Design a protein around this ligand. Structure first.
Ligand SMILES: c1n[nH]c(-c2nccs2)n1
Ligand SMILES: [Zn+2]
Ligand SMILES: [Zn+2]
Ligand SMILES: [Zn+2]
Length: 572
């Protein structure tokens, strides 16, 4: 009922009744908002509505204070003050960007650009508003009632009329009813339920929308710079394997927070785990948005850090299988590995947050709200894939706008930059170096002479918005007969439908460019499928070709990215 202004902190009884988040606005800022937007409902102890019986006047501009009550022009008593006067909405204790965040639908890229260029308190309001909007949008899709069951990985569904059909990919997790979360893949659909329950005909699914909690802590704490390493105690006996990062581990102790831009295979998990061997007394909470990224940190920690002092935090509502080698849910262990949504309310000497391009400003704030740390380290790469923004359909979101950390890495540069790629053949390293790294990524390996590119547009068929290019999978099939060493390759494409087809025709294991992020394969076969803005995204293209250690075959649709690939060209 009584709080502080989300724009200038001035205390107030006023909240905008028309904002989806009902932000507390002060007398001055509340006016500047109601007078510039369709938002005219103002909430105090009592709402600002005409007290006259059955009068439906709720617009604060058309209301007045008569005695200690509120009335419109038609019912105001002789002695009355217009609620809107002198640039103020009457309340207690007596902005252009705030209006755009309050009224936007989050479908344009300029909406996300603003949610990142604004003040710190408006970044939290934007994050709070966007997530609530994203969640209410989930209520606006049709229910799937089972019509029949084929096998243990197949069934047929009956969709709700009038309400749309949502996309079928692991990117949209349904919730069955209460028989666990379920996923689907294209008349015979594949049912992938978290719980092994014999699919009941008639049982229905619903996209589980969660309550959006208010954000309190900033996306980034205020930066502090120190004269010496603070609260952390370094070893002088620091393993030669981690000698390359000694200087950067010292920068970590001489700042409140630090940003590390680590391109593919430059030593991000090495840096993260080596930080624990450099400050061995220090308690480190390892966080990431995805379970796969918290597990990738676990696999590196298993190798270099004592298994007893490690704990893998697993949320009680167990969704997908994760890391099984640490003691589970021991919040007090020196090394805690946990996803941002499952983070407990604790403190740490250092907090490492990896895969920073996948974080949102909502995630950044949750991290600063649940973990109080001496030091914060943000590891990732703004040249890699960001979190998918389900409501965004108009315009492409640039890296400086993924989150506050990525904004810093693209504007002032990262504090630390891992510049030598030790995974990829020089053909791949030189290509991504020129494409997204300003020629600052260096190749540790030589050219493998196993990196091929083929310009083949083929034929694009659509299965709803997901694309398939059978002539591109046919060209791969031809290639494999003549290059049987490529039998061990992972098939990568920007579309799951293209992958579903290539899995049946080639038999190769399948990965979307997005699900391949953080992983490495000896050989990669990539079919671009289409020459759309999705498949031609340079961040997605960067992740696509940097998965390969030994060889890559790129069947290209785009003349632009094909001409940018520094690979051996193939004919057919
Ligand atoms: C030492 N300096 N960099 C590194 C690594 N880069 C890739 C994985 S480990 N070790
Ligand atoms: Zn204010
Ligand atoms: Zn409003
Ligand atoms: Zn009235």
């Amino acid at each position: 009922a009584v709080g502080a202004c989300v724009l200038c902190n001035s205390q107030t009884s006023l909240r905008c009744g028309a904002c989806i988040r009902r932000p507390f606005l002060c007398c001055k800022c509340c006016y500047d908002h109601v007078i510039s937007t369709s938002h005219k409902l103002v909430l105090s102890v009592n709402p600002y509505v005409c007290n006259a019986p059955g009068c439906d006047v709720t617009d604060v501009t058309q209301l007045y204070l008569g005695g200690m009550s509120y009335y419109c022009k038609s019912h105001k008593p002789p002695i009355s003050f217009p609620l809107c006067a002198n640039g103020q909405v009457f309340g207690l204790y007596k902005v252009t960007d705030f209006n755009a965040i309050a009224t936007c639908d989050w479908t344009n890229a300029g909406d996300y650009i603003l949610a990142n260029t604004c003040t710190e308190r408006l970044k939290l309001f934007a994050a709070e508003t966007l997530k609530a909007t994203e969640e209410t949008f989930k209520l606006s899709y049709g229910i799937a009632t089972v019509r029949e069951v084929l096998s243990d990985r197949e069934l047929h569904l009956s969709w709700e009329v009038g309400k749309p059909r949502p996309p079928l990919n692991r990117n949209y997790v349904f919730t069955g009813y209460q028989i666990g979360e379920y996923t689907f893949e294209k008349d015979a659909v594949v049912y992938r339920g978290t719980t092994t329950y014999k699919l009941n005909v008639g049982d229905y699914f619903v996209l589980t929308s969660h309550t959006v909690m208010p954000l309190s802590a900033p996306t980034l704490v205020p930066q502090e710079h120190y004269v010496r390493i603070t609260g952390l105690y370094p070893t002088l006996n620091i393993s030669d394997e981690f000698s390359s990062n000694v200087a950067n581990y010292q920068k970590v102790g001489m700042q409140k927070y630090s940003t590390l831009q680590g391109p593919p295979g430059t030593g991000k998990s090495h840096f993260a785990i080596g930080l624990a061997l450099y400050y061995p007394s220090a308690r480190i909470v390892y966080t990431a948005c995805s379970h796969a990224a918290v597990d990738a940190l676990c696999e590196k920690a298993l190798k270099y850090l004592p298994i007893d002092k490690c704990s893998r935090i697993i949320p009680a509502r167990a969704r997908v299988e994760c890391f099984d080698k640490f003691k589970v849910n021991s919040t007090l262990e020196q090394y805690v590995f946990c996803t941002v949504n499952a983070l407990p309310e604790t403190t740490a000497d250092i907090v490492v947050f990896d895969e920073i391009s996948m974080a949102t400003n909502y995630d950044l704030s949750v991290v600063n709200a649940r973990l109080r740390a001496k030091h914060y380290v943000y590891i990732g790469d703004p040249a890699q894939l960001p979190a998918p923004r389900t409501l965004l359909t108009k315009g492409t979101l640039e890296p400086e706008y993924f989150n506050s950390v990525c904004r810093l890495m693209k504007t002032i540069g990262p504090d630390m930059f891992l510049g030598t790629c030790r995974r990829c053949p020089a053909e791949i390293v030189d290509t991504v170096s020129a494409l997204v790294y300003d020629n600052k990524l260096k190749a540790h390996k030589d050219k493998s002479a196993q990196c091929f590119k083929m310009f083949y547009k083929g034929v694009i068929t659509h299965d709803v918005s997901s694309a398939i290019n059978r002539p591109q999978i046919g060209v791969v099939r031809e290639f494999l007969t003549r290059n049987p060493a490529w039998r061990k390759a992972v098939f990568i494409s920007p579309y799951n439908s293209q992958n579903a087809v290539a899995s049946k025709i080639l038999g190769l294991p399948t990965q979307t460019v997005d699900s391949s992020q953080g992983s490495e394969y000896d050989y990669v076969i990539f079919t671009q499928t289409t020459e759309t803005a999705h498949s031609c995204n340079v961040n997605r293209f960067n992740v696509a070709i940097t998965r390969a250690k030994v060889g890559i075959l790129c069947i290209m649709s785009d003349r632009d990215l094909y001409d940018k690939l520094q690979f051996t060209s193939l004919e057919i």
